């Protein structure tokens, strides 16, 4: 027979760059990398602006169903 | 006789490379490598993007039915 | 007389290298192995990819018939 | 008179070395010992891949008819 | 004849997607929680509010009568 | 003569595929497995929703009448 | 016939947003968040003064009856 | 019917503003926070001296009964 | 005729919602709930405190004479 | 016929708030939380000084005769 | 009738504040904050020299008979 | 009846100011201050030379049988 | 007629405070209490050296003849 | 008549003070104590060199014949 | 009559000072204290080379039969 | 009778002066103080060329026989 | 009359210091201690090294004939 | 008479140091400790090549016949 | 009679240094002390290049046969 | 007999020179010592270039068949 673990295109809905996922974990870095200038205050956490872009899209590109 | 826990080529469907099976383990970096910014932030967990369809190549083609 | 407990050839085409043994075994270590990234990521469960042919060797050409 | 328990030479050739019976204890081992690494997944059951030999040697040697 | 289990669609109406089963397995995740903050306190708990709605329909669309 | 303790294919209608007995045994995972996740709260209990179409098709499929 | 795990309309108005199930969950975390100045003294425990309505709206208005 | 959690107002009256917390969470700073003047001796431990009035409303006048 | 195993109304009144058996499984929880925090100290047996009106709600009105 | 089950009012005055239930249940705490400075020593078990008025109000004015 | 679990006033002589509780806690602190000074020797375990006096009486006044 | 926890002054005598425990206290100071001057080297560990009878005084007097 | 189960006294001044019951129940305690430090060596039984006097009077002075 | 459980005074002079059973629970802490700073090696299993003639003496001067 | 437990003089001669049990745990501390500069190489497990008649003397020297 | 714990002096061989512990335990302060020169490069690990002949004579010849 | 079960000394010379028992129970604890260093391999079982000739001397010398 | 649990010296040859005991426990050490680098990697089970022939002299050396 | 736990030299030609057992523990190390240099990256694991062979030497030569 | 964990040759073909785990060990190193430029920018982690092919060396030419 065939696979019954498929069939629905639930998860790839929910986790995927068409959904909430990528609203989630741009949040998180502005939480903490905006208010670190208190102890430290010095440029450092300025990198992660632009592997957020790259790193969905070398992880969900990679079967495509 | 001959066997009886094969002759119906259901697993192999089910827990294989043209199956469900790479779908959910493609996105369970991303639920946690892309969220841990918050307590670490630190260039860490990258090496994962390129071990999945490794791991995946030397373990399917091992038997091969 | 002679024995009873043989004469069909029938446990050694189920339970062998030739069979279903040997393809139920190379997929339980991926099932879990490949989804334990979210509490631990570590490389830690990889010296599992070479130990599989190793055990099926050393335990089935111990007697051959 | 003599005993009536022997004569026949039929428990010996039934278990023995060269029987069934060292067939069907090498297979138990693999069945269990080589699927168990979905809970634990550690270095533990390998201590048995020598004593079968050695079992089976210290017992059926004792008498020898 | 005919079977004997069937024939009064009164699990499928107790069992199923629009019955009371779910609204049972909605409240126990954040029922322990909303309220682990205090001992852990911590980001770890969040990926459960998205695989409810995915569990339930791998499992009762299998059959379906 | 023939035999005598079949002739009325009763309980292959009743203990089979197509019958009542794959609809109870497809709800008794998400009884306990859904629930669970108050004591435990892992991803353990998520490989049985594959072996459920697999044990019933290696099991009925074995004579077939 | 109907279902019988339900028609008492109970749980709803006890574990829901019009309850008391809200008044528990706001309370334990000022009672760990606003004492642990002691020990660690810094700024992580802070986003959770958002997160509360957050988790009670994707949660009791998944089913709603 | 209705709720049995709440209907006596008893953990109202004990975790709030006009009871014993607001007391008990403004001594904490002084005992740790004036006495590092030993080791460290700086500016520093002095943003909170605002943040506890704050802390305080932003979470009892979530729901308010 | 008719039934004997009823027509009395005796244990409609000893086990039912107005009687003394709503009395007896209420202070049970507090005699072993609220001295479980010698040995133990966790916040783990705080879930009963809503299932008690619950449970007898679901199983009192089902029949009902 | 009624109840026998009741009818005497002992229960209730040895299981209640005006009883003696309330002056063990208040030491049990202050035997171990007290005294277990030695090998923890740290600001944890001090939340139990108000659940225990909450607990005991939750519980016994439920029924109420 | 009346309770049968007090009316001896035995436990309220041993565990109170005029008995030998309040030296067996008393002394405890000095056991092991006074010999703390040797791997550690940091201004750290010093806020217990005025929460002795205040635990024992938020505890030993909640009822009073 | 009276107390049986005490009636014996015996950790009275033991653990008290004209006892031994006074001077077990006092030399595990010296024992890892004076020889600290190889990593450290600086005036840091001279402030303990008076907290030792002020904080034996204000532990002991404070209940006094 | 009367009772002629009792009229002798004798199995109160066998079974009671002012016989030899409480010197058998008095010396069990230290025999696996002041053995216990070897594999356990924890503060842990030590609640029972004012529970032997409270269990005694609350027992024999229910009836009292 | 009297009692027959004592009138011997055997376990008195077994199960005392000046008997054999303070010589056997001295020696026991000296036993695993002095030899566990194989792993350990830290101050910690040393109050119990003054616990052992309290112990036995709250318990054997309770009754006292 | 006397005691049992005691008479020949076996427990004294075997764990005592002058037997075997002084030579056991003196090569203890240097198995373990004397090797650990690998990875620490600090100066700390030093003040273990005094304690050793010390405890043995508040041990041995209690009952002394 | 006599102790049993000894009466072969094997263990004062072997764990001793003039055996193998002298030999292991000054290789193993050249094997990490000698190689340490990559990171630190600074005398600092030069007062152990005397402390070996030091804490083996306050050792062994504590009891010696 | 006199006695009749004695006057042989038969289980004496058998289950006595001078027979075979003492051999027997000599060897099973190396047989079972030896061998736990696989799974635990931690120092615990040895103090059953002197404990051997101690019990069989409390027992056999209670009576003597 | 004689015993008769000996008398053939048969356990004697097999239970002893010219046996084959000797050489089943010399070998379970280096199975479990010479693999234990995998995730420990430490230095800690050391101190077992030594202790093989004490043990094993300390408790054939008891009786001897 | 002689010893049945030998007479055959198979344990001594399997668990031996001219075997199989040291070629299994001579790539354990490079296989988990090759790869530590992610997170560590240190040189600490470099001492187990010559305890190979000393470990191997000083427990098969114990007994030889 | 011989042994049976070897005659197979095929851990000497995967753990060895001319296999695959020589691959896998040289990439690590790039992986992250070519990244390791952002928070710490120096000539440190420098000395790996020429370690890898003598680790190699000495540890598969120890045994060689
Ligand atoms: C401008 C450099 O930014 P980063 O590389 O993130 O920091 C490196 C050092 O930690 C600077 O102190
Ligand atoms: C100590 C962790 O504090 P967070 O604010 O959780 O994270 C910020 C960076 O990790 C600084 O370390
Ligand atoms: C550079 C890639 O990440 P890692 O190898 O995990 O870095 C080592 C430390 O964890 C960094 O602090
Ligand atoms: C922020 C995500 O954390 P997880 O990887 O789910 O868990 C980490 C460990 O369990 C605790 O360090
Ligand atoms: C390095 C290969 O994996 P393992 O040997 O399982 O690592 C042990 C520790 O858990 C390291 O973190
Ligand atoms: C090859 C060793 O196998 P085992 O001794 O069974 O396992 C090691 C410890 O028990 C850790 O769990
Ligand atoms: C996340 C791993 O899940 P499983 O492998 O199913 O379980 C292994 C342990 O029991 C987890 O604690
Ligand atoms: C006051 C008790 O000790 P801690 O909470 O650890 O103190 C904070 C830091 O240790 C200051 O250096
Ligand atoms: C000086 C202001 O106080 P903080 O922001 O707490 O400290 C910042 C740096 O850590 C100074 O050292
Ligand atoms: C947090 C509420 O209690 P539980 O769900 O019982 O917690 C699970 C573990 O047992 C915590 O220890
Ligand atoms: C510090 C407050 O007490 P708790 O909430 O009991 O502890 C929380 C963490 O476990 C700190 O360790
Ligand atoms: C001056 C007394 O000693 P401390 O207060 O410990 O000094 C603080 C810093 O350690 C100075 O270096
Ligand atoms: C000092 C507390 O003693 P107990 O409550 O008897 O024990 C609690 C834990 O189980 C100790 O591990
Ligand atoms: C004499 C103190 O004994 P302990 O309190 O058992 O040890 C101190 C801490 O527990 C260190 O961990
Ligand atoms: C230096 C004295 O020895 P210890 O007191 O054992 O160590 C104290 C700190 O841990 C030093 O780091
Ligand atoms: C000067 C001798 O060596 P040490 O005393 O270990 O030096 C301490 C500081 O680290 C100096 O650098
Ligand atoms: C030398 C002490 O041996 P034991 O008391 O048997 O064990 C102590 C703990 O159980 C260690 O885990
Ligand atoms: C002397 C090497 O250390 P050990 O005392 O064997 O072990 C200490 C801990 O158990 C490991 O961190
Ligand atoms: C260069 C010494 O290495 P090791 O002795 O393995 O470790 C000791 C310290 O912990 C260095 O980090
Ligand atoms: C040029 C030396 O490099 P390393 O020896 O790797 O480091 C030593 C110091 O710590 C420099 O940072």
Request: aromatic residues 10%; positive net charge.
């Given at each position: 027979q065939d696979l019954m673990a498929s069939g629905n295109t639930t998860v790839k809905a929910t986790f995927?760059?068409?959904?909430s996922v990528v609203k989630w974990v741009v949040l998180a870095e502005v939480l903490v990398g905006a208010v670190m200038y208190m102890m430290t205050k010095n440029v450092?956490?300025?990198?992660?602006f632009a592997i957020i872009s790259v790193f969905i899209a070398v992880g969900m590109a990679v079967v495509g169903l």
């Amino acid at each position: 027979q065939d696979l019954m673990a498929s069939g629905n295109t639930t998860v790839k809905a929910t986790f995927g760059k068409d959904s909430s996922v990528v609203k989630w974990v741009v949040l998180a870095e502005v939480l903490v990398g905006a208010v670190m200038y208190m102890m430290t205050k010095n440029v450092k956490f300025l990198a992660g602006f632009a592997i957020i872009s790259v790193f969905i899209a070398v992880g969900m590109a990679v079967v495509g169903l």
